[model samples]
Target: MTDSIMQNYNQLREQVINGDRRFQHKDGHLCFEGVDLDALARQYPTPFYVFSEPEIIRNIHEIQQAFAAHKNTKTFFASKTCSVMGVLKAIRDAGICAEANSQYEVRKCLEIGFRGDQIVFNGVVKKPADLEYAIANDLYLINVDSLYELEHIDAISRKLKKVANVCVRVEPNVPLVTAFHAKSGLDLEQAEETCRRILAMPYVHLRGLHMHVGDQVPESEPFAKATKVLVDESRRLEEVLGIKFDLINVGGGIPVPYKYDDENGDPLKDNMYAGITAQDFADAVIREVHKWRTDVEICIEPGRKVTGSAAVLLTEVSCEKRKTNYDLNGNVECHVEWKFVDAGYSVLSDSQHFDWFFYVYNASRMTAAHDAWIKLAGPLCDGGDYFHMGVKGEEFLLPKETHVGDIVAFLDAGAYTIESQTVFNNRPRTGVVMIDKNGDTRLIRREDSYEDMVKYDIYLAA
Candidate 1:
């Protein structure tokens, strides 16, 4: 490799791994919290996930510190991103609460030792049983997405003879630039009507307002504007309805730097730009919220920014092939190369579903120059199951020496990757291992075997 390519490779490493302070290169291999990734790959199969316990804790603490100035601020780790028992336990142990979007997610939070008061249930399409579960369990908060949902909660609460703590999810109609399709929340007029209806229900206690614009928001302006709108509505509701809001959930959309920055510490022109950090988003929302009322509690539910970069998906290249292109006249045109791995949309569906791109690198050749440009594909038969180009049309550049046996680590893959895995092609899901603060590693989840895949299947007479 040339010196310039080597320099660019080092710069990529520094920006994506080293700058984060969670990874390092040692003894010709990549290490996470002093645990060699190559060693872990040897013990476990490829395409498995490994998380840094310390990094998860650190991320929670950093977010807490960012909004520390707000005395009544609370952060609920959005459980949809990664609901593994170990990950949930880490979040709960760190004094951070959780937000659940489904009945299963709520049960998972409770099963993992998260108190009912530490969990907030938020989802657009809430089943009657889901509402009953939240009401019966006395969850911290249930965000009502519409007036119909408000009535449903009231009826459920009345039947159960329990006062359900609720918050109205207000739709500010603010434009967002995120990929996640989030179309919940009531409009201003609808929000007022919902609050009016909630006032008539004696079994429902209106706690506050909630709004989640979207996911992976790159800027804080949307949050600031939403805060202003929600706070204004809250004050108006208090004056007109004589109801006081205890909390205002701005909702979590803090952007994670999914793409690597250039040598000058700027995002590449063609990649998705994560312009703001967790602290910046917190400051933007908190500042605007405080300007409205300091007495009300500020709640933010961040999932990706907290856990996105804390884990690495280790996959080995199973096959490598090169192709040469020629013109019709038999003149040489160009050469193309491809590398296929054992995993694909079955493990990392976001790549295929949302065109999301996670940084791929040659972990075995940590210090090698990444001058080669190759098409990286998954073992799945689907043509869409690949990670060659990012959502922003950025191409993946890996080490020229990357081979069939070399381990390829996907960076910033901690959130929403494993939880969204499917049993496509009868392939069981991969396992997960976590390296704790003490530099000790343990298998939090075991890989699925062939029998495990068919364990739930019932055979009947043909």
Candidate 2:
């Protein structure tokens, strides 16, 4: 990676994990919004989620600036990433909409002051209560995933004597791509059948075509191709069903470059910035969207691309293990693997899933060489909990421990970590922090309390 990219990546990491104050001051010490990590650790303990306020606004504004190139563009914070009311409220203040997968998320949006009309309720297994709630409130769009959902929405809307606007999610039969394994839309035939079925319903109005190819698709070809497919299909659907779509929701799976360089020292291709900034992607989307008609409004629900780089996970190294490797020629090499001095996968869900290539610095010992390549492994008992060397044989020294309680950080964790975390091994979850553009910080949500673990208990002794 170039020095500039590495610097940008490091800057983003510090902003997210340590807080914006660290970057703002440019002091050698790592601090969370000028709040000492040691003090915060004393209060909240380890394994916490720290975020930057300026970073969130920067991310949202960057996307908004991208969409500004194209008229009539709307960006929704894909709430699946982190649904904390504070985070949602911050995103809403950025002048973007909210895309929700469940009733709880929709309610979260409402709770955070986002109107129902600005919400797009979408998912494969939406509860009937959710559909009724969405219909009753007249949400901006209800992305119907299956024929059954359409029937339910139609029934509810008819019962309530209201017209429900819906967008048929078309799972394009396009070639698979990215980390999101399964496609998020219906196939051509399925879309046609669903659209026809939707038209037959008395209350459901077919207003748009929604399609999500996959997640982390860096290239624009898939979105362009999917839009073309929808356009072609829309033409046919219009002729056959005689219905004009007022909206086309190309489901958001825009990729964000997480690991710039793998362990092998090869730079991961910049997906979002590959010959196109976020604006280029929006432009391509608008170009294809214009091919359909001038009236169709385009809505996107990008998750990782918007918020992935906004937050960072700051951790501490607790232990270290060094192994000596001898070659056939009797040349011995020392390999070091580091363990968190305090906590590990008890919080970072990404580390539990894959060999996360994180940026580590020695906060306790400044002279320990901050630029050394280290393979980061968690303290989980499982052998697979190790986070180094994939099938490709990538190599990096696990920055096991510079000292007891050495500060280590994992960047670009804003996307999935908060939303996907689980209480595996009885480890409590992390607290979330939200920072605004003005360098102000707030403890958006605190870490899970010990007492919260048994909130579901019924005390059957009575």
TM-score for each model: 0.93, 0.83
Score residue 24 of candidate 2 by CA lDDT.
26
Clashes of each: 0, 13
TM-score of 2: 0.83
Error of 2 at 59 (Å): 1.4
The worst-scoring run of ten residues by lDDT in candidate 2 lies at: 390-399
- Tens-digit lDDT track for model 1 on 20-62? 5888877778888888888889888877999888888888887
What are the per-residue Cα lDDT tens digits for candidate 2 across 194-239? 8888788788888878887666665678778878888788878888
Tell me the spans in candidate 1 whose CA falls farther than 4 Å from its real position. 1-9, 14-19, 175-182, 262-271, 390-395
Runs in model 2 with CA error above 4 Å?
Answer: 1-27, 31-43, 176-184, 261-276, 321-337, 354-356, 363-368, 371-375, 389-401, 459-462
lDDT of 2 at 249: 84
